Amino acid sequence: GFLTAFEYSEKRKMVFHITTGSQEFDKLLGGGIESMAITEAFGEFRTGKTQLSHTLCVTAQLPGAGGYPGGKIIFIDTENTFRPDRLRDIADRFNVDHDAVLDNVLYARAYTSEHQMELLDYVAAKFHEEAGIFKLLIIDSIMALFRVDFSGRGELAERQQKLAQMLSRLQKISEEYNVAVFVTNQMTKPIGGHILAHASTTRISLRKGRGELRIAKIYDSPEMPENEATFAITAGGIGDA
Amino acid sequence: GFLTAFEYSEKRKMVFHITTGSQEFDKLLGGGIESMAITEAFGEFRTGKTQLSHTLCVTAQLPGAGGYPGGKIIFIDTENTFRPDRLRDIADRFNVDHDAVLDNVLYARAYTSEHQMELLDYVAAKFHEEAGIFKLLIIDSIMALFRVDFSGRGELAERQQKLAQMLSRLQKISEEYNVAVFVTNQMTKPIGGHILAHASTTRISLRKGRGELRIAKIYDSPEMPENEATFAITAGGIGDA
Amino acid sequence: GFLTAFEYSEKRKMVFHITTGSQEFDKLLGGGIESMAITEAFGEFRTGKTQLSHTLCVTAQLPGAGGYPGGKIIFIDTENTFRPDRLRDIADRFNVDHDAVLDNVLYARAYTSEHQMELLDYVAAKFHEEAGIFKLLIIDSIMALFRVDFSGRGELAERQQKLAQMLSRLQKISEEYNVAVFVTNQMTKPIGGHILAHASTTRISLRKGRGELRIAKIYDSPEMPENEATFAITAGGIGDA
Amino acid sequence: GFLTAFEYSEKRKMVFHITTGSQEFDKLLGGGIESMAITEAFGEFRTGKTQLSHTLCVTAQLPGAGGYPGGKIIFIDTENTFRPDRLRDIADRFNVDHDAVLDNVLYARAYTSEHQMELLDYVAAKFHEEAGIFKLLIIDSIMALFRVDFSGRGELAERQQKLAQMLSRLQKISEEYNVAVFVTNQMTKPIGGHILAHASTTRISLRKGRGELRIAKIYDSPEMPENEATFAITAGGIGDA
Amino acid sequence: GFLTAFEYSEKRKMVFHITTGSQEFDKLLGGGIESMAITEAFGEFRTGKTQLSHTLCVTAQLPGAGGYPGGKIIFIDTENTFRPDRLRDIADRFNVDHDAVLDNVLYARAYTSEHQMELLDYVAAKFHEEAGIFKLLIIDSIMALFRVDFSGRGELAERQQKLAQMLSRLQKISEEYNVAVFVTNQMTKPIGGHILAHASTTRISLRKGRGELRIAKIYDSPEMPENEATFAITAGGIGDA
Amino acid sequence: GFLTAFEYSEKRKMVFHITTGSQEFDKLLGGGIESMAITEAFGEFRTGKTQLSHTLCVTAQLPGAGGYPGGKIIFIDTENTFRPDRLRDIADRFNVDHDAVLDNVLYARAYTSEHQMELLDYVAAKFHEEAGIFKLLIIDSIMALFRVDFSGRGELAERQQKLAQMLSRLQKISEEYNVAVFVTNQMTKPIGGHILAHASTTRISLRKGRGELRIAKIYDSPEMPENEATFAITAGGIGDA
Amino acid sequence: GFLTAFEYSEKRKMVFHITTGSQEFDKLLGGGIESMAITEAFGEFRTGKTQLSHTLCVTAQLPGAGGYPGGKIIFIDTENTFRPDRLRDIADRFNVDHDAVLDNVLYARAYTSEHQMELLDYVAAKFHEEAGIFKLLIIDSIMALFRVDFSGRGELAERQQKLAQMLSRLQKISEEYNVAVFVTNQMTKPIGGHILAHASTTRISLRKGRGELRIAKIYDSPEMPENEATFAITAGGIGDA
Amino acid sequence: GFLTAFEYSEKRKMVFHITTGSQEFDKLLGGGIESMAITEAFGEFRTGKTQLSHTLCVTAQLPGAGGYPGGKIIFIDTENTFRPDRLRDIADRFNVDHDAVLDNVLYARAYTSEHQMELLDYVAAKFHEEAGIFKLLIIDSIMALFRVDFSGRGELAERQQKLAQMLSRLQKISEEYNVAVFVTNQMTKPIGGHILAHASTTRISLRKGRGELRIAKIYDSPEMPENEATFAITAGGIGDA
C-alpha cells in the first residue's frame, strides 16, 4: 500500500490544474482547480458556486497551461440547477463547438444520500475502465442530501459515518485516478464540520461585490490580500475584472 | 445512469411553463409553474394557495407560451377544499367548456401520510402509461398529513425519513415524466425544514394587499421589486392588478 | 382511487346542509352543518355544544332548504348527557310527532377510546348497508375518551396514532357516505392540536352572552363581525334572538 | 350495539334518585343521588363524605319520590370506616327496623387496587342475578388504593390504565343495571385527574360551616347560590338546617 | 367476599380496646388500642414508642373494661430493643407474676424486609390455628427494614410494592382475626407516605415534655386540645400525670 | 421462628460487656462493648478507633464485670493496621502473658468487599463449632471496602444490597452466638447511610481533646454530659483521664 | 484464612524498610519504604517521583539497618522513563559494581491497563517460585494507563472495577510475599479517589524547593513539621541537604 | 516478559537521534528526534509541522551524531500534503542525490481511521523483515482521522478505545524495533486528551516569530529559555537563525 517517494513523485509529475476562467482566481489557486485533490467552494444565498460549476464544464475541455490536453467531465447535481444551455454561451467565449462540449460532460441527478454514494461507485468504475480520459468530477452540491436524509440530531452519528464513508471515496478517486474534484457546499461557517474540512485540500469562500464582482478567499485567513481574489460573473461565466 | 449533457439538453428542450393567470406572477416565475421541478407556494390562511391551485386546473389545459400544448392535471387534496364549481367560473374567464375542463382533472383525497404516498405510486404509473398526456400534479397541501401522523417534538426521526422519501419520489416523478409539480404548504417561516426547502426548486411566499390584491415573493428575498409580484383573486381565478 | 373532477362534481351536487335552528347560525355556516365534512364545536364549562347536539337530532329529520328530504341520525355519547326527553320539546317547536323523532335516531354510549373506534366500524357498515338513509353522525364528544385512556405524556405518541386513525375514518365516512358529521370538543385553545384541527373542515367556538344569548365564531378570526353569530338556547333548543 | 332514542327513552323512564336526607342537598342534585350515573363527593377530612355514605345505606331502602320503591345496597370500604352502628341511629330517624336495614346492605373491605376491581366483577354478576333488587353501589373511597399501589411521580402510566379500566366498568355497571353509584374521594382540587373527572357525571365538593353545618357545591361552580346547599350532620345522618 | 351489614355488625360487637396504661391516653383513643385495626405511633430521636411497646405486652394480658379477658401477644422487633427485663417491672405495677407474663408473649427479631414479611405469614397461620387466643400484634418498627433494603431512589417502585404488599396483609390479619395491631415508625412528617398513611386507621404522634411527661396527638390536627393527651414514662411503663 | 419472651429472657441473661479499659468510657456504654449487638465507633483520623480495637483484643480476654469469663477474639482488618506488638504493651498494663494473648486472637486481612463477606461465613461457622469460646468480633473497618468496589454516585443500588446483606449477617451472628461485634467506620457525619445506622445498636462518635485526651459521644446527642466521656490513649491502650 | 495474632506477629518480625537515600526522608517513613505495604508518592509536573524510583533500584540491593541483607527489585514502567544509565551513578555514590546492580533489577514496560495487570500475575508467580529473593516491586506509574484505557465518564464503573481488581492483587503480593511496593501517581489532589487511597498504607506528596531541594509530606496533614522532610536530587539520586 | 536492567541497558545503547536540521532545535531535544519514543509536534496552522516532516525525510538518511548511520523512512500522510519536490530542495542543502533520498522514503496515504491502523500492521511487519534498515516513522498527522470518524460529543467511548489501541501499537513499534516515531497533531491546547499526552514521550509546541522565524517549546513549560528554541523555515528545510 506504500510506494516510494520516487514512485510517488513520478505520479505527481502528472498533476494538472484546470483554469477557472479568472486569471486572478487561478493565481490564488496556483494554476487552477488542482487534480489529485478536492477543492471546495462555499458561499451563501446566491454566490457563484454554480456559475463556477458551469464554467469548469467548458474550461476542463480546453488545452491549458503546463501541457494540459483537456478532457471529459463528470457532473453530479443535487440542486437541480445544471443547465446545458448555459454552457453554450461559455463555449462561444472560448470559441469551441457547443455540440462537442455538451458531449464531453456526463450528467446525473442525485435524489438521496445513498443515491449520491451509488453514483460515485459508478464514476469510480468508469474512470477505471480507461484512464487519462476524464479530468474533472464536479458535485453540486456535496452535502445537501446529507442534511436532508439525516435532519434533527439523534441521526447525527449516522450522517457522520455515511458522509465520511463518502468523502474518503472521493479522496481516493481523486488521487487514484488523477482527476480534479470540485464541490460546492452551503452555510448554516460552512456545513459539514471536521469531516468535510479534512477531506477537502482547498476551501474557498465566496461573497458578493460591486454588482457582479465577486470575492474568493482561501477559507481560514490570514487577513492578508494575496489570500483573496476578484472575479466577475458574465454571459461567458467566470471571468476577470 | 448518467447521460451526456447533450442528451440532457435534448431533454430540457421540452421543459414548459403553466401560466398562473397573472402576467406579473408569471414574469416572477420565468413564464409560470415549471416542468421538471417542484414549485411550492406557502402563505398565510386566505392567501391564494388554493385559488392558485384551482386556477392551474384550467390554465394547465390551455395552449400556452413556448409551444405548450395544454394537457391533463392530477390533483391530490389533503385539505378537503377542492371545488369543481370554482373551475366552472375560471373556465368562463378562459372561454372553455366546463365539462371538458372537469374531464381533464383527475382527483383524489388523501386521508393519511401513508395514503398520500400510495397515491403517488399510482400517479407515477399513470404517467408511465402514456407520456405527455398529463402536465401538472398538484398536491394541496404537501405536508399537512405529516404534521398529523407525527407531532410531539420527539418523533421527527420517523416523520422525516417518510417526508424525505415522498419528496425524492416527487422530484423523480417531476423530472422523469416532464411534469410540473405544484404544492401548497403552511406556515409557523414555512414548515418542512431543510427537507422541503431542498426539494422545491422554486418557493413562493404569499400574503395579501388591500382586499383582493395579493403579493407573491420568491422566498429568500432579496428586497428587490423584481422578486415581488402583484396579483388579484377574482371569480375567474388568479388575475392581474 | 381518483375520479374525474366531473365525476366528483356530480358527487358534490348532492351535498346538503342541516339547519341548526338559528337562521343567524346558518348564514355563518352557509346553510347549516355541511355534509361530506366534519364540523367541530367547542366551548368551555357550559356552552351550547350539547343543546346543539340535541337540536340537530330533530332538524336533521325535517325537509329543509335546497330539496333536503330529512333523514336519520346517529348519536355516539361519551359524556353520558344525551336525553331523549329534551327532544320531545324541540319536536313541538317543529310540530312533529315525538315518537317518530325518537325512532329516527340511533344511540350508543362509548366508554373507552377503543370502544369509540369500534362504534365507528359499525356505523360505517350500517351506512353501507343502504344509503341515502342517514344524514348525520353526531359524536359528543370527540376526544374526551382519548384524554382518559392516554393521560400523562409518555403516552402521547400512542394517543396521537389512535386519535388520528379515528379522525381519518371519520373523514372517510363523511365523504364516502355523504353525511354531515358534527362533533363537540372541550378546551384546556381547543384540545387535540394539529390532528383534530386538520380533520375538521369547519370549527366553531362558543361563548356565553346576555343571559341565554350565545356566540358562535368560526374559530381563527378575522376579528370581522360576519365571521360571528348570535343565537339563543330555549325550551325548543337552538334558536335566534 | 345501538338502540333507538325511543328504546333509550324507555330505559331512562326508570331512572331514580336516592334522597340524601337533606331537602336542600336533594334540590342541588335534582332529587338526590342518580341512577345510571356516578356521583362523586369529595371534601376535606371531617366533611360529610362518610356520613353521607352511611345515610344512603338507609335512604336507599326507603320508598321515595318519583315512584322509587327502595332496594338493597352494596358497600365497598377501602377506608376501614363503615360502622353498622351508625345505621342503627339513622334507622331510628327514619322509623325503620335496624335488622332489616342491616340485612339489606352487602359489605366488603377492599385491601388493594386489584382487589377493589375483583370486587366489582363480583358486584356486576350479583346485579345480573336479579335485576332491580340492588339500587346503590357505594365505594368509600374510589381511589385511595390506586394512590397506594402507585405513587412516586413516574409510575402513573400503569395506575392510569387500571384506574380507567375500573371507572369504565363502573359506568357500564351503573348504566346497564340502572343503579346509582356513589363514591367518595380525597383532595390535594380532587385527585384522579381527567380520568375521574370524566367518569363521574356529577361531582360535589364538600366543606364545613359553623360546627354541625356543612356546605355542598357542584364542582366547577358557578358562584350562584342555586349551585350551593346547606345541610347538617346529626345522630340521624345527613339532615337539614 | 361480602357479608351483610348485620353479619358484619355481629363481627364488630367483638371489637376490644387494650389499655395503654394511661387513662388520659385511653380517652384520646376511645378505650385503648383498638382491635380490627392498625394503630401507628411515631416520634423522633427518643420518644416513648418503645415504652408503649413494652407496656402493651403486659396490659394486653389483663382483664380490662368492656369484658375484655386479656390474652396473648406477638412481638416482632426490627430495632433490637425488646427487653424482657423491662416487663418484669410493669408486671409489678399491675400485680401479676412475671413468669406468666413473659410466657404469654411471642417474640421474633426481623433482620430484612423479606424476613419481616415471612414472619407475618407465620403469625397469620398461628392466629388461624386457634382463635380468640392472641389479642395484639406489635411490630417495632414498621418500615425501618424497608428503608434499609431499598435506599436511594431507583429502588422506590420496589419498596412501594413490597411495603404495600405487607401492610395489606397486616390489615387483613387485624380484621380477619380480631387482633389489635400496634406499630412504631420514625420520621425524616412520618416515613412511608400515602402507603402507610392509608393502612393505619389511627396515627399518633409523640413528643417530649416537662422532663418525663410526654405528648400524644392524633396526627393531623385540628389544633383543638381534646385531640391531645399527656402521659408519663416510669419504672412501671406508660402512666398518667 | 419465635420464642416466648421467657425463653428470650433466658437468652439475654447471658449478655455480657467487654470493658474498653476506661471507666468513663464503660459507663457511657452501660458496662462496655455489648454482646448480641453491633457497636460502631467512628471518628476522625487519629482518633481512638484503632487503639480501641487493639485494646479490646486484650480486654476481651480478661475475666470481667457481670460474670464475664473472658474468651477469644476474631479480628478482620481492611485497613492493614493491626499490630500484634501493640498488644504486647497493652498486655503488660493488664499483667498478662503476651503469647497467651496473641494466641487468643484470630486474624485475617480482607482485600475486597466480597472477600470481607466470605470471611464472615467462615467466622460464623467457626462460632458454630464451639459455642462460648469466642466473645468478640472486630471489623476494622466495616465499610472501607464497599466505598472501594462501589464509588461514582450512580452505582449505590448494588453496593447497598451487598452492604445490607453483610450487616444483616453480622446482626444474626452477633445475636445467635452471643458475641459482641465491634466495628470502626470513617466520616465525611458517618458513612453508611440508613443501612449502617440501622444495624449498629450503639454508635459512638470520637474526637480528640488536648493531645492524649479523647472524647467519646453517643451519636445523636443529646448535649448532656452524661452522653459524653473522656479517655486517654497510652502505651497500655485506652485508659482513664 | 485466619492465622493467630502470634503467627502473624512472627510474620511481622520479618518486615524490613528500604532506605530512600535520605536520612531525613527515612525518619519521616520510620526507616524507609516499608515491606508488606504499598507506599505511594505523588507530585506534579516534575517532582522526584522518578528520581526516587531509580534510587530504590540501588538502595534495595544494599545491606541496610535492622539486618536487612539487600535483594532484587522488580520494575514496571508505564512512563517510558526508566534509564539504566542513571543507576550507574547512584551505584558509585554507594560504591558497588554497576554490572551487578543492573543484574538485580527486572524490568518491563507496560503499554495497556490490561498489560499492566498481566505483568502482576507474572511477578506474583515469580516471587512464589522462590522467596526471600525480591525485596521491592516498583510501579512507575500506578494508574496512568487506567486514565488512558478509560477516559470520559461512561467508562468509570469499568475503570473502577479494573483498578481495584489490581490494587487488591498489589496488596496481597506485598503482604503475601513480604516485599515493599512503591508506586508513583500524578495529580488532576492525587488521582484514583477512594480506591487508590485505601490501597496504599503510606502516601507521600512531593513539591519543589530552593533549586534542587525537595519536600516530602505524609499526605493529609497535620500542618505539624515532623510530618514533613527535606531532601535533594543529585547526580547520585535521592540525598540530604 | 521482563528483561534485566542490564539487558535493557544493552538495548538502549542503540538509541539514536535524528537531527531536525536546527542546532537550536536539536539541543532542546537532547540531540534531535529520539528512537524508542514518540515525539509529537503540534502547532497552529503554518507552523513547521509539515516542514519538519519533510526535513526529517532527508536528515534521517544522513550519517549523524552518536554513531547514527542513517537509514530509511516510512511516511503516513493523512493530510494529503507530502510533496516529494520539497525533498529535492532539502536534499540540495545537504548535498545528497535526489533520487537516492526519494528512494529511501516509503509513503502511504491513510483515508480512514481504520485504514490508518491497518497501515501500522503493515509497517510493523516491514520493520520485522529486516531490522535496522528503517529508522523513522512519520505520521502526518496522528489523529485527524479519529476526529473525522468520531465527532459529536457523545461518541468518544469508541474513538478513545481505537485511538488508544493505535498509540499502544505505536509505542510497541517504536520500542521493539528501535525506530524514532514522529507525529504531527492539531490544536483547539493539543487534541487527544490524556490518551495522546501519555503516549508521546516528548511533546513540542510550535508557533511563529517574525516571518521565517519559528519558536519551539517543550509542552508543559517551564518559562525558562532553555525549554524554548528558535529556528527558521527555508527552501532547504528546518534551519538555524
Curated annotation (Swiss-Prot), chains A, B, C, D, E, F, G, H:
Protein localization: Nucleus; Chromosome
Coiled coil: none
Biological processes annotated in GO: chromosome organization involved in meiotic cell cycle; DNA recombinase assembly; DNA strand invasion; double-strand break repair involved in meiotic recombination; female gamete generation; homologous chromosome pairing at meiosis; male meiosis I; meiotic cell cycle
GO CC terms, sorted: chromosome; chromosome, telomeric region; condensed nuclear chromosome; lateral element; nucleoplasm; nucleus; site of double-strand break
Protein residues bound to ATP: 43-50
Purpose of the protein: Participates in meiotic recombination, specifically in homologous strand assimilation, which is required for the resolution of meiotic double-strand breaks.
Family: Belongs to the RecA family. DMC1 subfamily.
Subunit structure: Double stacked ring-shaped homooctamer. Interacts with BRCA2. Interacts with the MND1-PSMC3IP heterodimer. Interacts with RAD51AP1; the interaction is direct and stimulates DMC1-mediated homologous recombination.
UniProt protein name: Meiotic recombination protein DMC1/LIM15 homolog
Originating organism: Homo sapiens (Human)
Phylogenetic placement of the source organism: Eukaryota, Metazoa, Chordata, Craniata, Vertebrata
Residue window of the full protein shown: 84 to 338 of 340
